[PDB]
């Protein structure tokens, strides 16, 4: 489970997508710091350009990465279904435009963490903000909001992603996720509580292909550490030894 | 700089130890409130049983915590370096006994501020304070001595901290110290002042692993704000309104 | 409880407030002597510049440090409530004006008293003396109203603040206060007395925030010490040795 | 090239030896998935039992199969010489033992890889570690270094391997290696990395045959990607977002 | 059965055909490498000019030496047969055209493996795609689906095979097929499975008769090997290794 | 010449020797198919009991029914000298023992391939493996090696026949043999080959004569076709066509 990610693990993505006919794949590579809840990896589209958006992909391109507080560790899902791994599947649905679904196997190959996914995008506008490329090449920070789905031995996962509109205004993507263990041991039933995401985008001035950069951070939370009263009492203790 | 500390931080500590041969690490976290100088960490040796007395590891276990009074913030280092952050190192004399030397990095990884140590310890005796475990699970109020060293941006640092022996006597621990930035940009290079620090220490009741609770207070002083002339004037004219 | 205030304790105020939609932030530090009843202060707006006049804000911005004769200690309740602190909670009617609802807690961050604010007026007048800023900068010396509430374990709390006009006319801030304990343990409930206040305010040359500097005395004073009938006696006395 | 592995390939693998005069041949049958740097073989002793240790073998029985991350590409020279492939040659020396000496025809045969090896040993022990089957039946993670030989338009390698004795000792093997290409065409001469590899030995509870099966990943590493700067950079920046 | 195939094995074909009353005869030589599933062959039209495009006789014109992976050699009917051999016949319909019937004996005569054939083409269009010579000289990969016949202790084969047509078009040819042996010894009647086959057509720039030069690559598939289970159950043991 | 061949052709041998003083007589019968490279053979001792072993007469008792490869056709000797035919010259050294010294006239009369023989044999020991019928009832395979003899229009042929002994030893034939044109035409002068022959002796159960059933394969190889580089260029575009 989680002793397969103290150090530094190397990531591999692949991506097969089909966006209203449009098809692409997308290889991606990097590394995962869950001790910091940090990920650094570049993704490339292989097929040529990318028809969506890179923003719009940043959610489908690795939770297993997130920092626990050693408080909430008994809560690390993501962590617990390895090696073996676990299916996460979502369908996201972009305000006044198509939707896409996701289904992803993320599980270890030796050392490699893989993420290998295939995407399916249907009902979206020619000319709306997705196909029409009208997106800022930015993200938001946000929460995602987790609970246990004990039926099917796994996860139920829901958030609200912003996409910034380059007129100024938003692009919703509202994500509905369910993660399933691979493997039939047990796994990690965790109570409710969120992960708080921050991700920065750019690109390598030295890559000419279509690619995106990314740098990630996130952080379990949500769960008290209970330890409120001592600290309190800590605070009484120090007026009466000063 | 100091902008990255107006609210609370989430704070991860992570150590690597070796004293006479004894290997060990510790994983901390806590949380760290600038505006109050206050810090609420719990550190867990992530090994088994610690080889030297929690006391001993305290100064080693976040000076970018402290409370600046405004007319004192031109003389904040520790948030100058942020995010990039700085190296803290030190050697620890323990008086009649061995020495810790430490080097730190303290920055950010995204939203966490993280102290990543490494300290060696050699020269103590078996039966000594230290390896012997002979020193109370308390601490004393300190101040901490910091100059301005441009030779190398940075500060040079030096306090004595004296720690309570079982026996009602005191191991004097002389700490040497310097901090450097990471990052190339300014950083604000201090007159000379200190810090004031007062720590409690506790156990939580819940946990069964080797570990300390630390509560600590750090605010900066012994600069004048050089008010002193508007306040006696200010008193002279409201004996001549009552 | 009132041996933390036996010398010099430092100050820090924050105040967040909200004023017919104008929103702003306050800093404020200093130094309170409760053996001479003496605050020095400084305060500034962290936000730009204060929508209400500064005077309006003395009262929001610490009886703790009220200099309480020895004869009359046992009705000290501000003290009696540290370290833990109290809730002082505030209405304050402006004549023919809009009005203030504060909500403060008051306590100790390790050596450092803090007094944490929450402002939020309503219904003034854009062109009446606060929004228009036709006070003058200066303070009157008040009488401040204390009794027991024992259904809450506090203390009830009445006067009336007058705030010059610049045309030479008054304006009455009719102030309504309750301080309940953050604590469970004992506190002083008081007899009925008051504690008398005088204040100057002042700007710093140096300063070029807007700001105030405030030097506040506050005296208890209301209940006899009853040694009327000794001193008489020692008069008579007095006669019949020389 | 590189564009014969993007999928599943399948795996033939034919060995003819003689050790010591004990002569012997083997079979293997296998896939290889170069995206993952993935290989599962079976290996039969087509002649009766074979006379060394299976682990001896391992090096010997597909460095066409590595996955060479992006930004390495270039020095893959193993899928550079494909279809027409390279002749791998080795001298591996066993510390106060015999050796091996070893050739071997690595290229597509249609749609198979096919691996075809001659090995001839002499100077071992009869009662040694290796005719005396001392070794268990494990295998240890080890990097194996890779230099061009511009003179041979092909690599020169070297790495050590060790085997782990029944006795919890160690039986080292040292690895001398070249390949060259059996094409007149162009090859990617790399420059100095090395490929990180684990292997997993298993036995078939349904085969009754003299045999081993194989799982092993394949990693090349060491050459910077140079992108350090531009997450650091990207680290900054988020600084200034939140 | 099997152990004839160890080796390289010289191969003739004899032909001898009537297509809609042009009548011809081909002769060719080869070798065959069942170890590689490997053919190299080259055919002659011993009676002047081919009346037919040589791509249309390429499955008329040696599957005993398909490759056999190890877990499925029990299925590989048509080296069991040998030395006394099978019969092979086949109806193969040229969609929109004619129909060839061929009737082939595959056998050894001595060392060499000889397949001698007789073709008899009936109803083609004089000036459709094989009459009128409008077929590409090349050759699509196609898979062989294998049943046993239990009733004629033999098999039944059908496939579809796609010529290439001179204005991109396809020329579909409809196999169906039937092996039985020659001897009255026992055969391997095979569970359902398939032979994946590619093909090369080129000339002897040195032969000035009608010919064609095939190379063409044979492997079974479509039957588990079953230890899917044993490699998932290794990659579960090195995570625990690492 | 090779036109004469490509068909069943009906066989003669006769044969008169004499072996140490013992005479005999000897009438065979078969069929050749040169397309084959094979021979079906009966032989009859028409004077009564062979004094020889059967298996020492095998290679005096059809050259010109060899499988000539089509790249091979231009050194075919043998059919070349057809119909007039050769004359075919040996002698046969027996290691430790006798010689035989054999003329031959092999040529058509009709329809039927006749070979007319005269055998000398002298020196035999009269207890030897030959004279003393110790070996064994089989045969071997061998290769025969042709050269041109330009100076008798025809070639010298060399090889070593090895009869196995009935105790397990081995009775080395060395072959000396020469064949020459009957006609004055011309004939096909080969570069140097070989041809590599199999044979399988047995008895007919119906026979009560002394006779000898051969059944003989006898291909030509040792010249190159020259088509390797061809195949290499296909199996490279095959690689290009997946």
Same mark, same amino acid.
Request: proline share 4%.
């Given at each position: 489970?989680?002793?397969?990610?103290?150090?530094?693990?190397?990531?591999?993505?692949?991506?097969?997508?089909d966006?209203?006919?449009?098809?692409?794949?997308?290889?991606?590579?990097?590394?995962?710091?869950?001790?910091?809840?940090?990920?650094?990896?570049?993704?490339?589209?292989?097929?040529?350009?990318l028809?969506?958006?890179?923003?719009?992909?940043?959610?489908?391109?690795?939770?297993?990465?997130?920092?626990?507080?050693?408080?909430?560790?008994?809560?690390?899902?993501?962590?617990?279904?390895?090696?073996?791994?676990?299916?996460?599947?979502?369908?996201?649905?972009?305000?006044? /435009?198509? &939707?896409? #679904?996701?289904?992803?196997? +993320?599980?270890? %190959?030796?050392? !490699?963490?893989?993420?290998?996914?295939?995407?399916?995008?249907?009902?979206?506008?020619?000319?709306?903000?997705?196909?029409?490329?009208?997106?800022?090449?930015?993200?938001?920070?946000?929460?995602?909001?987790?609970?246990?789905?004990?039926?099917?031995?796994?996860?139920?996962?829901?958030?609200?992603?912003?996409?910034?509109?380059?007129?100024?205004?938003?692009?919703?993507?509202?994500?509905?996720?369910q993660?399933?263990?691979?493997?039939?041991?047990?796994?990690?039933?965790?109570?409710?509580?969120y992960?708080?995401?921050?991700?920065?985008?750019?690109? /390598?001035? &030295?890559? #000419?292909?279509?690619?995106? +950069?990314?740098? %990630?951070?996130? !952080?379990?939370?949500?769960?008290?550490h209970?330890?409120?009263?001592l600290?309190?009492?800590?605070?009484?203790?120090?007026?009466?030894?000063?």
């Open positions: 489970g989680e002793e397969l990610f103290t150090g530094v693990v190397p990531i591999l993505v692949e991506l097969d997508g966006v209203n006919g449009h098809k692409f794949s997308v290889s991606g590579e990097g590394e995962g710091d869950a001790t910091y809840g940090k990920l650094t990896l570049k993704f490339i589209c292989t097929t040529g350009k028809p969506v958006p890179w923003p719009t992909l940043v959610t489908t391109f690795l939770q297993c990465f997130a920092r626990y507080p050693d408080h909430m560790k008994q809560h690390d899902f993501f962590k617990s279904a390895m090696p073996e791994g676990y299916v996460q599947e979502r369908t996201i649905f972009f305000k006044d /435009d198509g &939707n896409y #679904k996701t289904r992803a196997e +993320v599980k270890f %190959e030796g050392d !490699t963490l893989v993420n290998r996914i295939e995407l399916k995008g249907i009902d979206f506008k020619e000319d709306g903000n997705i196909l029409g490329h009208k997106l800022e090449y930015n993200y938001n920070s946000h929460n995602v909001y987790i609970m246990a789905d004990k039926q099917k031995n796994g996860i139920k996962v829901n958030f609200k992603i912003r996409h910034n509109i380059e007129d100024g205004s938003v692009q919703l993507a509202d994500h509905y996720q993660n399933t263990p691979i493997g039939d041991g047990p796994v990690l039933l965790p109570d409710n509580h992960l708080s995401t921050q991700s920065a985008l750019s690109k /390598d001035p &030295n890559e #000419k292909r279509d690619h995106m +950069v990314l740098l %990630e951070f996130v !952080t379990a939370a949500g769960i008290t209970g330890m409120d009263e600290y309190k009492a800590m605070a009484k203790e120090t007026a009466a030894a000063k």
